[PDB]
Design a protein around this ligand. Structure first.
Ligand SMILES: CC(C)(COP(=O)(O)OP(=O)(O)OC[C@H]1O[C@@H](n2cnc3c(N)ncnc32)[C@H](O)[C@@H]1OP(=O)(O)O)[C@@H](O)C(=O)NCCC(=O)NCCS
Ligand SMILES: CC(C)(COP(=O)(O)OP(=O)(O)OC[C@H]1O[C@@H](n2cnc3c(N)ncnc32)[C@H](O)[C@@H]1OP(=O)(O)O)[C@@H](O)C(=O)NCCC(=O)NCCS
Ligand SMILES: CCN[C@@H]1C[C@H](N)[C@@H](O[C@H]2OC(CN)=CC[C@H]2NC(C)=O)[C@H](O)[C@H]1O[C@H]1OC[C@](C)(O)[C@@H](NC)[C@H]1O
Ligand SMILES: CCN[C@@H]1C[C@H](N)[C@@H](O[C@H]2OC(CN)=CC[C@H]2NC(C)=O)[C@H](O)[C@H]1O[C@H]1OC[C@](C)(O)[C@@H](NC)[C@H]1O
Lengths: 175, 177
């Protein structure tokens, strides 16, 4: 009974972006910052609607990383949420099926940082990243020690999940 | 008589993808590489059609950069082309006007790397030569992009960006800019 629409950020109205912010604030219970919202904008949104009420969301944003020393185009998953009373009905899974298709069509690798939410991602093919993770700090890479074990990856061309990943720079949490 | 469509890479038919590749090889007279084509995929396409024939294209790719020490979200312009016989009719201008709207709605700053045929057109829709230092990752360490300094141009909707500040781009294959 849910309707799914895939829209680029550039195709959203101000009120649709506001409804997205509202859904994220309510669904994360205070764990979602302004930086997290900036991270949600600029790529593709998969949105779940009950009639006209936005009830679920996930975004896929392009990131430009290194896998060891090789450049890799990444589809990075952000702001995955389903309104509380709509949970445990398969909406999050449909969001991820749609997310996988977008990634397969556009990028060499899907990545995300997971809560927990890890089991849902595993059920649609994602695996824990086994290599070391690095982020830019003051223009120089350092270990993302806190995120290791939490980042998951998905490939439809095969990628070595034991290799090191070097993400690109942003505000807030780099992963 | 030209129709414009804005489509994400994920919304493109396979037909349009192959048409795009041929259009770029034909339009660039030999200096459009496989890495250049990879750089074109993953973001928004603005496509111009004459009836059913694709005649013009520009892509806007999300990039994550540093402006001095500050993280900035970039709409990076790639793979700007109009088929030879359609040029000098304003199609490229319309492509950029559509590009400007996408950038304004999504990113903090527009950036591109221009040519001879490009600069004046981009300037005509508000873009300015980037005056600051440019840097790219080599072996995980930033170095100056001397080659590209003076050729990269930027665009800001509100217009409040220090065009003399340094830019550090994110990593990719082929040309980083
Ligand atoms: C994570 C989240 C998006 C999942 O949304 P969801 O719609 O509940 O996802 P699904 O319903 O597809 O799967 C949820 C669970 O319900 C189960 N489920 C689905 N349909 C079901 C049914 N008909 N009967 C019983 N259980 C069912 C699934 O098997 C899954 O169980 P698992 O998590 O043990 O695999 C949601 O919990 C959420 O918004 N959390 C807060 C935001 C957040 O943490 N986001 C970051 C996640 S990294
Ligand atoms: C750059 C490019 C895309 C421009 O496409 P275009 O459709 O010719 O862009 P426009 O028609 O809007 O403007 C092009 C020129 O025609 C002029 N022009 C605009 N409207 C015109 C009209 N109605 N009648 C005649 N000339 C016109 C513009 O002022 C510009 O002149 P300039 O070169 O002096 O600025 C095209 O040359 C091209 O495909 N080049 C090959 C690939 C390439 O190099 N792309 C640029 C990489 S930066
Ligand atoms: C130090 C923070 N690190 C991780 C950062 C990630 N941006 C975050 O992404 C989710 O949350 C929000 C809001 N904040 C944004 C996007 C969300 N992701 C998706 C797919 O929608 C992770 O959620 C954070 O991980 C923490 O939470 C889980 C955990 C297991 O308890 C810890 N892992 C050691 C903890 O570090
Ligand atoms: C060493 C190459 N450096 C620049 C790299 C840029 N990826 C390139 O972008 C355009 O072309 C192509 C195909 N290759 C891809 C996308 C195009 N851009 C747009 C908006 O569609 C620049 O075109 C290159 O610049 C060269 O050309 C111009 C010049 C002034 O003569 C020289 N000096 C800077 C020369 O370096």
């Amino acid at each position: 009974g849910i309707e799914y629409r895939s829209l680029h950020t550039s195709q959203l109205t101000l009120s649709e972006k506001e409804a997205l912010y509202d859904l994220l604030i309510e669904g994360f219970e205070g764990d979602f910052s302004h930086d997290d919202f900036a991270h949600t904008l600029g790529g593709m949104h998969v949105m779940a609607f009950d009639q006209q009420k936005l009830v679920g969301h996930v975004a896929i944003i392009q990131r430009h990383m290194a896998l060891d020393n090789t450049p890799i185009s990444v589809g990075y998953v952000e702001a995955m949420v389903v309104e509380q009373s709509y949970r445990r009905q398969g909406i999050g899974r449909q969001l991820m099926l749609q997310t996988n298709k977008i990634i397969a069509s556009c990028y060499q690798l899907g990545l995300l940082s997971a809560s927990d939410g890890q089991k849902l991602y595993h059920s649609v093919g994602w695996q824990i990243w086994k290599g070391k993770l690095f982020e830019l700090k003051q223009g120089s890479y350092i270990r993302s020690i806190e995120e290791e074990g939490g980042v998951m990856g998905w490939k439809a061309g095969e990628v070595d999940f034991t290799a090191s990943l070097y993400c690109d720079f942003r505000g807030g949490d780099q992963w």
